[PDB]
Design a protein around this ligand. Structure first.
Ligand SMILES: *Cc1c(COP(=O)(O)O)cnc(C)c1O
Ligand SMILES: *Cc1c(COP(=O)(O)O)cnc(C)c1O
Lengths: 396, 396
């Protein structure tokens, strides 16, 4: 119905000047989602407990159902969590790790995940190995060091237990060869934890063909919902591992109340207090996306096509290059700044205050890179806007 | 300014018919809080990242400061958490437990806490003892079995490490002798984890004289803020125990990033994604309470006085009794129903649907009890309202 680009600006709820090149961090939802979001506040403020106890349940069961469809997965294999870090941790914590089990990560693994792994190792006797990845690299050359690491670990007599993988690197943002890495884990006997925080709502995803051991995603990053909102995919063949949430609560299951579906689903049903309304905007966001956006695929292809061109443009104006070896099969472009605390500081100051947009930077190799994010309301003009901005900002 | 009772109905945002005898579960906040809450949504929707990165910090530093004042505690000893269960767990998880350490709980300890303790014991070699408490009991008779348990445990050659205590029992709701129990832990060398989920905003609290080893509270239960909102008190003499949040994240601290106050405070500063707006309504709720409610004490005394009389009234109409041995020094009354799944079900059906109010019940000894909660907008009439309702509901 509405052609994408700036013609979609009227469907959303931002300052007309505000340029959102960073939608995934907090989210970006349409009018019909903020409306229905606000429609759920009233029903909470008009009858708190009847909303809570009766009117909340079924809409959540609906939202699960659509997400399970959007992943080509079974609704019984999908549960809702507060944020990604909770889900990944929830999986890690429930796994009984021996002293000979090895957890494999990469130099692209999210820092919070490394910390989570660092912490468990204090009271648990396992160990870890970090597959060195220094982008730009090729998709098969990553899988090369992976099976190189797994074969060494089996040669040392240890047991490659679990491998942490991500769809998109947080920053520097690329699409990792995660399908290939899931496969290598299948043949070797390694469990594949997939941190797909940037995944659903950005590019097509078929968990039925992928068959990932565990799949985490942040709906609030690309599914047009407010933060925090996530979901956890575990296939039935692995639902036995997860016996409790993090933190634990009433759905706990021991290895052997009256005021109160499979055991796995109730674990994530009887949990401490939660705001569920972001999850209850999944239907209205996925209806917007079928009726206004012309279906999921329509959205994905724009996000990929805006990201390709727009990123190459900004690269030129600055005089640098967009990280690449497709690792750019994503609505994200990570562009290098011509720059080899305060400065880094000041740069961001200008964005939020002066150019009411915002970008993320990172320390790499003799240069600082930035993360640009596409979305159906931006246009190639907007990315050329930021490009020229950044060049002057850079130089100043 | 406004006299309490139904004259305070105009300051809040509920259905005019709706009777809220259960405010603590979800919360009950005034107009000036929902307003300012909504004022923070716009600033998030107008400039997401500048709100997030600049405009969010100081108001949180303010909210901490008032809560630290309201507890007579230092602002450096107080951090914000998402809900209670997170905080209690966060404390439990960080404590290194030996195989000879004993965790002491009671038959009043929250079920989710028991589950949390059950779970850690699977991968950790400690053990536990449960002090049997069958209310109605006297305050000193609880402390009697407590030191009876601690002396036995030291007689068995084990080390009484930690003791889980609560200000208010979740249900059946009473005020436990927690001051006395904190003291007994001081002399014996036992750590006092206080689940004070029902505490702040309901009765005065001086952590400086109490000196609890760890103190958890749910602000959304009695401080006029929306759920979920909590806070964690740890005195400096124990801040060394807590090295990470649950789930872990960037503030982690090992026993030995660039896009980024004591170490304890940063742990709870660098955490995964969060909605902070309930915490940012602490100033506007505590201003309402000093200017409209006539100060904290004014609020407490009503809540205690409404709860005393109102509960005794409902007790009579039914023909039963309010649980008691002051254990009722709280704005909560737990009344026995003349009743010795579906029925229990149906009872609640009627409340939310028919009498658009809501109450909690529980299985006890030959009888089912209910939890009634006072608040500055209810009146003794409202509790006499529910009393007669309940009697007929009961009989039917
Ligand atoms: C966004 C993100 C996370 C965590 O998301 P939270 O909502 O902050 O838990 C983890 N890993 C990656 C790669 C991410 O991009
Ligand atoms: C309310 C309550 C809790 C937990 O509160 P959440 O916000 O659900 O974590 C724990 N213990 C007691 C006694 C409570 O009353």
């Amino acid at each position: 119905t509405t052609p994408f680009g700036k013609p979609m600006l009227k469907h959303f709820c931002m300052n007309p000047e505000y340029r959102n090149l960073n939608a995934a961090t907090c989210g970006s939802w349409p009018k019909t989602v903020r409306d229905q979001w606000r429609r759920y506040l009233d029903d909470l403020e008009a009858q708190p407990d009847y909303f809570s106890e009766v009117k909340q349940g079924p809409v959540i069961q609906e939202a699960r159902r659509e997400v399970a469809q959007l992943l080509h997965a079974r609704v019984s294999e999908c549960v809702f969590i507060s944020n990604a870090t909770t889900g990944i941790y929830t999986v890690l914590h429930n796994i009984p790790f021996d002293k000979d089990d090895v957890i494999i990560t990469f130099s692209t693994t999210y820092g919070a995940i490394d910390n989570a792994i660092a912490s468990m190792a204090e009271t648990q006797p396992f160990q870890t190995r970090k597959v060195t990845v220094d982008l730009p690299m090729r998709g098969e050359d990553i899988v090369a060091r992976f099976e190189g690491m797994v074969a060494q670990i089996k040669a040392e007599g240890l047991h490659p237990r679990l491998a942490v993988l991500e769809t998109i690197v947080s920053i520097p943002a690329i699409r990792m060869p995660f399908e290939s890495l899931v496969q290598a884990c299948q043949r070797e006997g390694v469990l594949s934890l997939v941190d797909g925080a940037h995944s659903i709502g950005q590019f097509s995803l078929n968990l039925e063909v992928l068959q990932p051991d565990f799949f985490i995603m942040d709906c609030h990053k690309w599914l047009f919902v407010p933060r925090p909102c996530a979901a956890l995919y575990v296939p039935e063949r692995n639902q036995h591992y997860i016996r409790s949430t993090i933190p634990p609560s009433f759905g706990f299951i021991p290895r052997d109340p009256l005021w109160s579906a499979t055991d796995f689903e109730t674990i994530f049903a009887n949990v401490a207090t939660q705001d569920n309304m972001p999850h209850m905007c999944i239907p209205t966001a996925l209806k917007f996306r079928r009726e206004v956006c012309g279906g999921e695929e329509a959205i994905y292809q724009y996000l990929r096509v805006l990201a390709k061109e727009g990123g190459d443009r900004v690269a030129a104006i600055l005089g640098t290059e967009v990280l690449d070896e497709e690792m750019r099969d994503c609505g994200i472009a990570t562009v290098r700044l011509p720059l080899a605390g305060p400065a880094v500081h000041y740069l961001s100051m200008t964005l939020a205050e002066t150019h009411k947009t915002w970008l993320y930077l990172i320390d790499h190799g003799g240069y600082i890179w930035v993360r640009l994010c596409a979305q159906i309301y931006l246009d190639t003009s907007d990315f050329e806007w930021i490009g020229n901005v950044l060049k002057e900002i850079c130089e100043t």
